[PDB]
Design a binder for this molecule. Structure first.
Ligand code: PLP
Ligand code: PLP
Lengths: 398, 398
């Protein structure tokens, strides 16, 4: 009798599932606003010029593909800690942080979940409601329980800071509380610097272990501005974890470039702990892929090349703010009677449109407009050319 | 209290922790015979000509870095199944196999471990003794018990087929049994075609689930000849799993190019099971890195680059066999009384020298010769320039 005979088919991934549905739809006027990738005005998903130049350099100068260390390219780790904590942070001078290059932000999250479940007493992880759907899947797969805390006020399209704190009042010491560093997924609402500080002081008091999902650094306001909430926690805590991704701000989606950074009280504890993290990595993928991280390190290490990239990231952040403004205006022109001003106040690539599961489904089957079932819409998928058909289909469904 | 203060330090990797000590040693004339990478006569770890050719083609024709599917590049999986099973295998025509691109062979083993642990009643994995050390860590990370079965005859330097058969007597039906496709690591002794057939018949009678690990396809005799063992199993079994790697037969170590292939009774079953394998990938690294696998797919699907790659693989295999002969010859001329003729009969990059842990440590600290503590020596690291100092050191420690 076969071992695979009684396996149950898995449900479709709500995000990556739409990509295959979109790839099959034959209608020419399709619009893809599901998966979080950046489109330019042309509607293509380009490769950054800084990335093409780095790859050109690596092609002519690479002499070996020999294995990287378990934790990856050292310069990649040093440059990652500078972006997260600053040029002259105390965590760096005191040698309190160790970084491992991982295959994407998702890889950085699994590495952390494996490390925590196999080496600590942690067993419960708090994730915002709503949040990235894959957060639950990653932590559950590592054997950790996942609890939800309040976050979003649907009636006012704002952060419910009172419900959030009242919800986190149930998290005991030693628990992991997952925070979006910036551009919350899918709400696009981030705490203010004061709200961050309120959570930081509340975190050290109740004894939580902070863990920062940080996939959109530079898409809210700026590389440094988007890290204030994190750097407010880092100046107050003795321990914290940061899983970051370069897929978005470098357009290196399929190369899987990410980092998991440990912070401990001193250098002897972070190194001791980092040895078990390297062991959890060894038993997973052994060592990380070089090409994507090698590109990021090349860009950050070269001033002339970094300048090119910082501008390309700025152009991405602002093209989204243009489509965001244009989205709201065009809705009113096409006959929408609801108020969509709150979309202007949301950060990042997404926007919680407030559409229902039925309206979203109807947009796909009747108009070929593809969005996630939660009503999350990729603002970076909108262009001047597809804006009018996109808004006409939304109004027809309201 | 700190969440990390109670963590226990992990030991250095017996293979990767070795290259750290080698980098620190300052004795002039160090020799590295540890990690399993290929060196040329110069003593460097080169990039294959076909790989550079493919990387240039990709740099010119790549227009986007958008995410791959959970299971990776389609063409990569198609050409992977042809290499393993044959140009016109029945497994492929009957659509019984599904392949998933993974980060290296290690990633294929972890994806299978998570898949089996979360979706089947598999609770035990049988691995050879000796074996690649990381085998036990990968399956343990998923909560699977790992038993060992006999394999090597340390007296005759041969396969102890009688002990192998007897030690696998308590292997239940539905247990997993791990076989090295070819170039057994570290012994270098592979089953004969007659022995493969004997194991295939026994495996179907006992109800095992065979799991093949192919890290060195093409390094024993050839691409087709090295797959005879697998293809004997494939012709008789309804279900099996294959974790293959391109790190070494393509020289793409740090790009993490691997493949996990499911085989089931029929198309409907493998599809149902493969959907759960994609779910385990999504919860780990989301989707695989494109560059490495893209290089492999380009070469394999182009007769011009493929004929070049196949000749490069032959050149690597033929240099290793020449170093095997020179290694035994120089040991004789340098005064060794022990008979090392068995080195010739071993396939792959490694030769189980038969040295004790004490002799290996004495070679390292007294002569700067670095080999794994199990006595495993990388013949691919020997050169005409380091052969004599190397052999002098061994004779001194015998
Ligand atoms: C909040 C958040 N964390 C992690 C990820 C995963 O990033 P990556 O594609 O680098 O694995 C995403 C987006 O994919 C995300 O939105
Ligand atoms: C038997 C065996 N399996 C798997 C691997 C994993 O190789 P990689 O992770 O580099 O693809 C190796 C060597 O590393 C090996 O020798």
């Amino acid at each position: 009798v076969g071992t695979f005979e009684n396996i149950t088919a898995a449900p479709a991934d709500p995000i990556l599932g739409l990509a295959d549905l979109f790839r099959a739809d034959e209608r020419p006027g399709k619009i893809n606003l599901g998966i979080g990738v950046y489109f330019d005005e042309t509607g293509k998903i380009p490769v950054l010029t800084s990335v093409k130049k780095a790859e050109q350099y690596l092609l002519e100068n690479e002499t070996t593909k020999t294995y990287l260390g378990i934790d990856g390219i050292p310069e990649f780790g040093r440059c990652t800690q500078e972006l997260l904590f600053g040029k002259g942070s105390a965590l760096i001078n005191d040698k309190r942080a160790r970084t491992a290059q991982t295959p994407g932000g998702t890889g950085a999250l699994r590495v952390a979940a494996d490390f925590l479940a196999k080496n600590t007493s942690v067993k419960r992880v708090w994730v915002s409601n709503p949040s990235w759907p894959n957060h639950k899947s990653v932590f559950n797969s590592a054997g950790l329980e996942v609890r939800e805390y309040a976050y979003y006020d649907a009636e006012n399209h704002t952060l419910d800071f009172d419900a959030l704190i009242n919800s986190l009042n149930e998290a005991q010491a030693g628990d992991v509380v997952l925070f979006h560093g910036c551009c919350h997924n899918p709400t696009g609402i981030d705490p203010t610097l004061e709200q961050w500080q309120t959570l930081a002081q509340l975190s050290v008091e109740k004894g939580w272990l902070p863990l920062f999902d940080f996939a959109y650094q530079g898409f809210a306001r700026g590389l440094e501005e988007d890290a204030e909430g994190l750097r407010a926690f880092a100046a107050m805590h003795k321990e914290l974890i940061v899983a970051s991704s370069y897929s978005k701000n470098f357009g290196l989606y399929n190369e899987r470039v990410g980092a998991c950074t440990l912070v401990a009280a001193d250098s002897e504890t972070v190194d001791r702990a980092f040895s078990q993290m390297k062991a959890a990595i060894r038993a997973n993928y052994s060592n990380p892929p070089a090409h994507g991280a090698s590109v990021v390190a090349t860009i950050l290490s070269n001033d002339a090349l970094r300048a090119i990239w910082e501008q390309e990231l700025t152009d991405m952040r602002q093209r989204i703010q243009r489509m965001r403004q244009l989205f709201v205006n065009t809705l009113q022109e096409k006959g929408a009677n609801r108020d969509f001003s709150f979309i202007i106040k949301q950060n990042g690539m997404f926007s919680f449109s407030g559409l229902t599961k039925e309206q979203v489904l109807r947009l796909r089957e009747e108009f070929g407009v593809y969005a996630v079932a939660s009503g999350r819409v990729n603002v970076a998928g909108m262009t001047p050319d597809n804006m009018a058909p996109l808004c006409e289909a939304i109004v027809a469904v309201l």
